[PDB]
Design a protein around this ligand. Sequence first.
Ligand SMILES: O=C(O)c1ccc(C(=O)OCCO)cc1
Ligand SMILES: [N+]
Length: 259
Amino acid sequence: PNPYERGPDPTEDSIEAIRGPFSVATERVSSFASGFGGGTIYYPRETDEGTFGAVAVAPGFTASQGSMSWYGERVASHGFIVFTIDTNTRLDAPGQRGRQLLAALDYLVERSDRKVRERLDPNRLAVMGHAMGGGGSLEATVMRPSLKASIPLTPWHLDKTWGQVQVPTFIIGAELDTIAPVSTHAKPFYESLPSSLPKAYMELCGATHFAPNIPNTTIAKYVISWLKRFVDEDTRYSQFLCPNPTDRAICEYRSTCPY
Ligand SMILES: O=C(O)c1ccc(C(=O)OCCO)cc1
Ligand SMILES: [N+]
């Protein structure tokens, strides 16, 4: 029995559903928090199944947490703590956004409310980011290799080599992305990840740079599965990740299955 498994046995319908089995409560964190510009914590109300893991979600260049708000109720209702954060300034670079993703996770572990702290397993943390926040997601794993998962969403970064990343990384790219072209960003990041790293690359057909900013079932179903598999060690979700998904919305998928 996995001590981290939460919720009933999943199906493809359950991971695609807009609402998971857990009721969600929210809390506002002031932007004057140390190390980052505040945000909103989405946590499950139910507590009788055990403490949950947490993921901090970073926005892109000049964007706020509102561009990532739909991940809050979507992911947290499946049994996770979600921290959609704002950066110190809207002009922050990927390297700075990686530091503030860690500062957001440290706030959850060290200085969070007792409603949040009681529901948090501080040993199982993850990061997720959009574009420049996706570059900061890669940065956060190099800065903290003890992280359990990492999901760069249409990532943007000047550094193309990530052969020292030790955290399971799930890169999602948009085929028609011209701001962070997958040929020069998303794919070079994935191919430079260690060949032995538990990694995956999902390219969405005909998607643009800001597709992760609105509800997307294809993004939602496999972001949930990736967090479940590596933050919860929940092998009940390995069926959705290995072998490679065959969704019509996916134009290309690469992975190092089995995990
Ligand atoms: O012009 C760029 O280099 C550049 C432009 C935009 C971004 C970015 O993070 O897009 C997401 C904003 O919501 C990254 C780099
Ligand atoms: N595919």
